[PDB]
Amino acid sequence: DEFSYIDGNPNGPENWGNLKPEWETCGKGMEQSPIQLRDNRVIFDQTLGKLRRNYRAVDARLRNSGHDVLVDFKGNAGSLSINRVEYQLKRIHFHSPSEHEMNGERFDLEAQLVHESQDQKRAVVSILFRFGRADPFLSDLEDFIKQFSNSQKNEINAGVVDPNQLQIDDSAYYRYMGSFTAPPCTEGISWTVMRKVATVSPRQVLLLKQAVNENAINNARPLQPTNFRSVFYFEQLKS
């Protein structure tokens, strides 16, 4: 509710950990996200496999927390499987600019798919976007997003929303253990960042930026220290 993205503000990212006891891990944890992703420091693990997703088009609500817009699925939007553990797709958050970097490059938008197992284990799958051709997923969502832009509504029924419109190429990704990228910054989160970069139009990102509070126009947390944690990579060969 009460944190900013402005570097050097009292509530900005470097102080999140000191704003309230519930947020302490933001400041004290050593497996925080996002991180730099560096090809020259990854561990190859072909045993990871192409990403295995079983997603369903379900009814959803657009929500505007004031610092991001997220899609919040009502029904069972399906699931992501990792080592036969099954994580249900719950929410998709939007950050502009990206929070993760790949080889020192920051991207124009990042979408973060939040999944949860019955055991309450969390897995996030991120998509990184450059400006280009419109994103098919956000296309169906644009008129709902435009509403946030002066009106006091911060929940809108977006109708049935289809997660299979998302530009996700399952053949290559990074894999590491990290944290939520907004308070409470809880750790134990499995992150998967897709190697293939998507496109989004400037208009779509404009719409998202129009929707949040002023202090969150850019809503990317700064990169956090890797701290020697491992970063796995998988990529499918022709073979």
XYZ file of C-alpha atoms in Angstrom:
239
model
C 0.000 0.000 0.000
C 2.717 2.435 1.034
C 6.072 2.105 -0.751
C 7.614 4.087 -3.676
C 9.929 3.292 -6.642
C 11.816 6.639 -6.437
C 15.503 6.125 -5.685
C 16.438 8.332 -2.799
C 12.936 8.862 -1.442
C 12.174 7.895 2.218
C 9.854 5.062 0.926
C 11.918 4.185 -2.138
C 13.389 0.719 -2.799
C 16.571 1.040 -0.808
C 14.421 1.768 2.321
C 11.513 -0.703 1.789
C 13.101 -2.956 4.373
C 12.949 -0.163 7.035
C 9.415 1.083 6.417
C 7.661 -1.633 8.494
C 8.561 -4.837 10.270
C 6.497 -6.923 7.822
C 8.863 -5.725 4.994
C 12.116 -6.472 6.680
C 13.218 -9.199 4.242
C 13.230 -6.550 1.491
C 16.184 -5.172 3.347
C 17.736 -8.194 4.993
C 17.189 -11.163 2.686
C 20.072 -12.512 0.594
C 17.934 -14.182 -2.184
C 16.107 -11.152 -3.397
C 14.870 -10.520 -6.972
C 15.236 -9.278 -9.562
C 18.822 -10.220 -10.516
C 21.118 -9.692 -13.474
C 20.951 -12.780 -15.758
C 24.523 -13.431 -17.171
C 25.027 -16.183 -19.817
C 28.684 -16.482 -18.772
C 27.672 -17.521 -15.179
C 24.789 -19.958 -15.780
C 24.731 -23.679 -15.040
C 23.367 -25.737 -17.996
C 20.821 -28.297 -16.970
C 19.213 -30.165 -19.927
C 17.261 -32.199 -17.341
C 15.030 -29.124 -16.783
C 13.064 -29.719 -20.072
C 11.002 -27.359 -22.148
C 8.698 -25.502 -19.812
C 5.488 -27.470 -19.196
C 2.349 -25.299 -19.033
C -1.337 -26.318 -19.063
C -3.197 -23.000 -19.039
C -6.988 -22.466 -19.373
C -8.895 -19.369 -20.574
C -11.008 -18.286 -17.549
C -12.894 -15.233 -16.350
C -10.701 -12.522 -14.794
C -10.482 -9.158 -13.125
C -8.079 -6.365 -13.922
C -6.790 -4.845 -10.751
C -4.802 -1.688 -10.205
C -2.966 -1.758 -6.890
C -1.875 1.803 -7.543
C 1.698 0.597 -8.279
C 1.035 -2.012 -10.947
C -1.766 -3.491 -12.973
C -2.328 -7.207 -12.631
C -4.718 -9.744 -14.135
C -6.380 -11.738 -11.364
C -8.034 -14.950 -12.617
C -11.323 -15.988 -10.975
C -11.449 -19.620 -12.075
C -8.783 -22.202 -12.558
C -6.569 -20.585 -15.277
C -4.647 -23.877 -15.381
C -1.205 -24.682 -14.177
C 2.589 -24.828 -14.624
C 4.329 -28.072 -13.814
C 7.931 -28.224 -12.446
C 9.202 -31.714 -11.457
C 5.584 -32.928 -11.364
C 4.733 -30.384 -8.636
C 1.761 -28.475 -10.054
C 1.508 -24.650 -9.540
C -1.773 -22.964 -10.344
C -1.682 -19.791 -12.404
C -3.223 -17.042 -10.149
C -2.041 -13.586 -11.202
C -0.019 -11.714 -13.888
C 1.743 -8.458 -12.857
C 3.058 -5.846 -15.272
C 6.328 -3.805 -14.718
C 7.654 -1.082 -16.866
C 10.650 -0.996 -17.465
C 11.691 -4.649 -16.850
C 13.030 -5.610 -13.458
C 15.279 -8.522 -14.642
C 18.140 -7.738 -16.965
C 19.681 -10.175 -19.534
C 23.366 -9.611 -20.154
C 23.166 -6.051 -18.917
C 20.100 -5.183 -21.046
C 16.951 -3.793 -19.423
C 13.735 -4.306 -21.409
C 10.622 -2.202 -22.037
C 8.138 -4.276 -20.011
C 8.138 -7.436 -17.933
C 5.041 -9.613 -17.223
C 5.183 -11.762 -14.171
C 2.968 -14.879 -13.911
C 2.439 -15.806 -10.266
C 1.595 -19.499 -9.637
C 0.966 -21.346 -6.356
C 0.837 -25.039 -5.504
C -1.545 -26.646 -2.957
C 1.501 -26.658 -0.569
C 1.561 -22.852 -0.978
C 4.916 -23.144 -2.893
C 5.337 -20.184 -5.357
C 6.713 -20.113 -8.939
C 6.913 -17.024 -11.120
C 7.434 -17.132 -14.906
C 8.597 -13.754 -16.451
C 8.336 -12.528 -20.016
C 10.607 -9.722 -21.142
C 9.406 -7.410 -23.905
C 10.934 -4.978 -26.363
C 8.914 -2.349 -28.261
C 7.639 -3.796 -31.562
C 4.449 -5.451 -32.654
C 1.517 -5.299 -30.259
C 1.278 -7.947 -27.558
C -1.806 -10.199 -28.403
C -2.655 -10.720 -24.673
C -2.621 -6.988 -23.751
C -4.580 -6.221 -26.921
C -7.683 -7.875 -25.501
C -7.082 -5.996 -22.296
C -6.411 -2.432 -23.493
C -9.847 -0.940 -23.188
C -10.158 -2.224 -19.618
C -6.718 -0.791 -18.832
C -7.685 2.656 -20.303
C -10.512 2.900 -17.680
C -8.008 3.058 -14.806
C -6.641 6.240 -16.403
C -8.768 8.878 -14.625
C -11.594 6.946 -12.952
C -11.537 5.753 -9.341
C -12.225 2.146 -10.335
C -9.384 -0.095 -9.409
C -11.110 -3.406 -10.166
C -12.607 -4.072 -13.629
C -14.204 -7.236 -14.976
C -12.123 -8.060 -18.005
C -14.255 -11.033 -18.854
C -12.758 -14.320 -19.927
C -9.005 -13.897 -20.289
C -6.827 -16.322 -22.163
C -3.269 -17.069 -20.796
C -2.374 -18.848 -24.118
C -2.308 -15.507 -25.946
C 0.929 -14.800 -23.902
C 4.213 -14.810 -25.904
C 5.883 -17.646 -24.131
C 8.444 -19.779 -25.913
C 8.939 -22.876 -23.791
C 12.207 -23.990 -25.446
C 14.652 -21.855 -23.297
C 14.739 -20.173 -19.871
C 16.687 -19.203 -16.827
C 15.835 -20.872 -13.468
C 16.883 -19.592 -9.989
C 15.528 -19.053 -6.443
C 14.567 -15.546 -5.560
C 11.884 -13.404 -3.952
C 8.864 -11.285 -4.714
C 9.972 -7.968 -6.250
C 7.621 -5.817 -4.146
C 7.147 -5.872 -0.390
C 7.035 -8.123 1.620
C 9.765 -9.458 -0.675
C 9.255 -12.994 0.631
C 11.896 -15.543 -0.522
C 11.485 -19.258 -1.520
C 10.138 -18.145 -4.898
C 11.075 -20.227 -7.950
C 11.734 -17.898 -10.862
C 11.708 -18.885 -14.478
C 12.704 -16.122 -16.916
C 11.965 -16.919 -20.602
C 14.992 -16.505 -22.887
C 12.928 -15.433 -25.932
C 12.016 -11.744 -25.758
C 8.466 -10.674 -26.708
C 7.159 -7.603 -28.337
C 4.747 -4.969 -26.951
C 3.668 -1.699 -28.525
C 4.501 1.705 -27.110
C 0.770 2.397 -26.811
C 0.261 -0.685 -24.604
C 3.046 0.389 -22.231
C 1.661 3.937 -22.248
C -1.706 2.584 -21.132
C -0.090 0.668 -18.270
C 1.913 3.704 -17.156
C -1.201 5.907 -17.181
C -2.936 3.596 -14.752
C -0.673 3.775 -11.642
C 0.198 6.397 -9.060
C 2.752 8.957 -9.962
C 5.498 7.422 -7.897
C 5.179 4.142 -9.788
C 5.230 5.364 -13.429
C 8.414 3.305 -13.510
C 7.672 0.322 -11.353
C 10.835 -1.768 -11.613
C 12.641 -2.668 -8.404
C 16.456 -2.132 -8.799
C 18.625 -5.229 -9.429
C 19.559 -7.072 -6.195
C 22.912 -8.738 -5.405
C 23.098 -12.305 -6.829
C 25.078 -13.290 -3.691
C 26.711 -16.388 -5.305
C 23.368 -18.029 -5.772
C 23.203 -20.368 -8.749
C 21.363 -19.539 -11.951
C 20.403 -22.506 -14.143
C 19.656 -22.322 -17.826
C 17.899 -24.692 -20.137
C 17.721 -24.551 -23.916
C 16.370 -27.189 -26.293
C 18.758 -28.213 -29.048
C 17.687 -29.347 -32.541
C 20.035 -32.081 -31.243
